[PDB]
């Protein structure tokens, strides 16, 4: 009667085929879906399996071997506290290497107080100088030991996500969507966008003559935004005043994994005018220098990038990419919904690209319209997308704002940018000893249901991982702890349990290389 009958997806990369697969599984044979289609590594977050691949019925043992996928236990931040050149290895500060981890999972609590706050109490008490991540996360020792996140037979050990080749994932999903979910793939470019009297898109015209008619249209055309920006004329909110990076130079490097294994984490390596990612996979790693054009020249960044990896810049294939940092004013206008780069983009500092797509796809089915296109459905969708993006945007900027580096104009200028009021409050709260967005559920519920994580994506553990990782600690511990000395004494058993877990994980887990060879061999 009024149900959507036909959906047309413009764009055939990761965003397009994730959208085509998920909507085709959700809607079944009730909707015709057609996609019009005209690697330096990518990292993800743990919810990708339960929200996406589990929805499609795809076990990790099936889709991982077909995309050269590898495991991610954390993001490791390197040289964000010490001045110097852009180098792959961590510098030394206070006898330790200048690195810290941002693992997944939720911190345990004693007395409804996160473990981070007991670590901060012991740092203030002067009885320990251990870093926050090594005291509260057992995953830190495993990643140093380059362990897999699971035993070879599948026994679980630590919360993990995935590194993979985005092109191979897109091809896997295309072969899934077309062979199993009746999604129709159409080659060729888009000649014109047909609109009716109200401005709603009515069909996409190919260069051959074919109208791809539909009731709902999904813009997955990447930075080009052929539908949402060009056709629908929705303006883009440039946010590069707040996040200065807007360029990247990237490549693939073959890696002899038998020398030092395969790191089960994404690296984020501080540079003179930005930061470099390192995304390890079996036999090779993807890497890219993200920098600000306003502080480094193209050739400068290119040479800095090659110098860090010992690459010959004259005989090295390089991707030179310019970024659009920000989001559309509205992600969904009339019957056009933008997903992926067509909607918004942030530098991949905390690996939120696939998550932004997965979240936009989930929220789309939660607000799925009919041909009436009730304004409340797209308004509520746009608010969820807008709040999801701005929250992560402010979180990423705090990595630069809180870093103590002032040695280059770039690092120093980040301290001169306007700090958003809500992040100002979070830093003031953290300094007063308060938790920031402490988790209200256990880890099973958090990762079990997507709406629980969505409403609290960056928890207290994450703000402590970044703030304490960058050397910022509370002015004083949580004041109530000075009234609960028995809690402090009891909570120390939690630190001894982490040390117990660190010993057994290093001593019994297989290497990350061993698991990848079992999975891909
Ligand atoms: N909601 C995410 C938050 C998170 C923790 N550590 C991270 C590292 C990278 C990116 C996101 C995260 C999760 O717990 O899974």
UniProtKB/TrEMBL annotation:
UniProt-annotated binding residues for FAD 1: 12, 15, 38, 43, 190, 341, 354
Domain of life: Bacteria
Keyword set includes Transcription regulation: no
Binding site for FAD 2: 12, 38, 42-43, 190, 341, 353-354
Keyword annotations: FAD, Flavoprotein, Nucleotide-binding
Protein name per its UniProtKB record: Tryptophan 6-halogenase
Taxonomic lineage: Bacteria, environmental samples
């Amino acid at each position: 009667d009024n149900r959507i009958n036909r959906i047309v997806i413009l764009g055939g990369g990761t965003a397009g085929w994730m959208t085509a697969s998920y909507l085709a599984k959700a809607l079944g044979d009730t909707v015709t879906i057609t996609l019009l289609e005209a690697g330096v590594g990518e990292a993800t977050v743990p919810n990708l399996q339960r929200v996406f691949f589990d929805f499609l019925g795809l076990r990790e043992e099936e889709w991982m071997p077909e995309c050269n996928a590898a495991f991610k236990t954390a993001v490791k931040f390197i040289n964000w506290r010490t001045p110097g050149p852009g180098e792959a290895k961590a510098r030394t500060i206070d006898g330790r290497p200048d690195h810290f981890y941002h693992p997944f999972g939720l911190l345990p609590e004693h007395g409804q107080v996160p473990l981070s706050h007991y670590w901060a109490y012991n740092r203030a008490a002067g009885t320990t100088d251990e870093p926050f991540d090594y005291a509260c996360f057992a995953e830190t020792a495993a990643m140093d030991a380059v362990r897999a996140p699971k035993w070879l037979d599948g026994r679980p050990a630590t919360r993990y996500a995935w590194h993979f080749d985005a092109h191979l994932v897109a091809e896997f999903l295309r072969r899934h969507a077309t062979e199993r979910l009746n999604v129709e793939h159409v080659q060729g470019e888009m000649q014109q966008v047909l609109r009716d009297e109200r401005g709603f898109i009515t069909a996409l015209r190919t260069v051959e003559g074919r109208d791809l008619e539909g009731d709902l249209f999904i813009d997955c055309s990447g930075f080009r935004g052929l539908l949402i920006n060009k056709a629908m004329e929705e303006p883009f909110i440039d946010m590069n005043d707040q996040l200065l990076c807007n360029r990247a130079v990237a490549t693939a490097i073959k890696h002899d994994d038998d020398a030092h294994g395969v790191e089960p984490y994404t690296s984020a390596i501080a540079m003179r005018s930005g930061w470099s990612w390192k995304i390890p996979m079996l036999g090779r790693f993807g890497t890219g220098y993200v920098y600000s054009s306003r502080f480094a020249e193209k050739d400068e960044a290119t040479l800095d990038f090659c110098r860090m990896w010992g690459l010959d810049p004259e005989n090295t294939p390089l991707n030179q990419v310019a970024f659009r940092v920000g989001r559309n004013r509205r992600a969904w206008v009339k019957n056009c919904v933008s997903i992926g780069l067509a909607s918004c983009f942030l530098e991949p500092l905390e690996s939120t690209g696939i998550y932004f797509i997965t979240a936009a796809i989930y929220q789309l089915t939660q607000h799925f319209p009919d041909r009436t296109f009730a304004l409340a459905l797209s308004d509520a969708f746009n608010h969820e997308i807008e709040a999801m993006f701005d929250d992560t945007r402010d979180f990423i900027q705090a990595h630069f704002y809180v870093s103590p580096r002032t040695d280059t104009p770039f690092w120093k200028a980040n301290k001169d940018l306007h700090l958003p009021e809500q992040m100002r409050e979070k830093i003031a709260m953290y300094k007063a000893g308060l938790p920031i967005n402490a988790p209200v559920t256990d880890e099973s519920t958090y990762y079990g249901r997507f709406e629980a994580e969505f409403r609290n994506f960056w928890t207290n553990g994450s703000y402590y991982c970044i703030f304490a990782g960058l050397g910022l600690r509370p002015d004083n511990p949580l004041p109530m702890l000075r009234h609960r000395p028995e809690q402090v004494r009891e909570a120390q058993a939690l630190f001894a349990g982490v040390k117990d877990k660190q010993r057994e994980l290093v001593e019994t887990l297989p290497s990350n290389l061993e698991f990848l060879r079992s999975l891909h061999g």
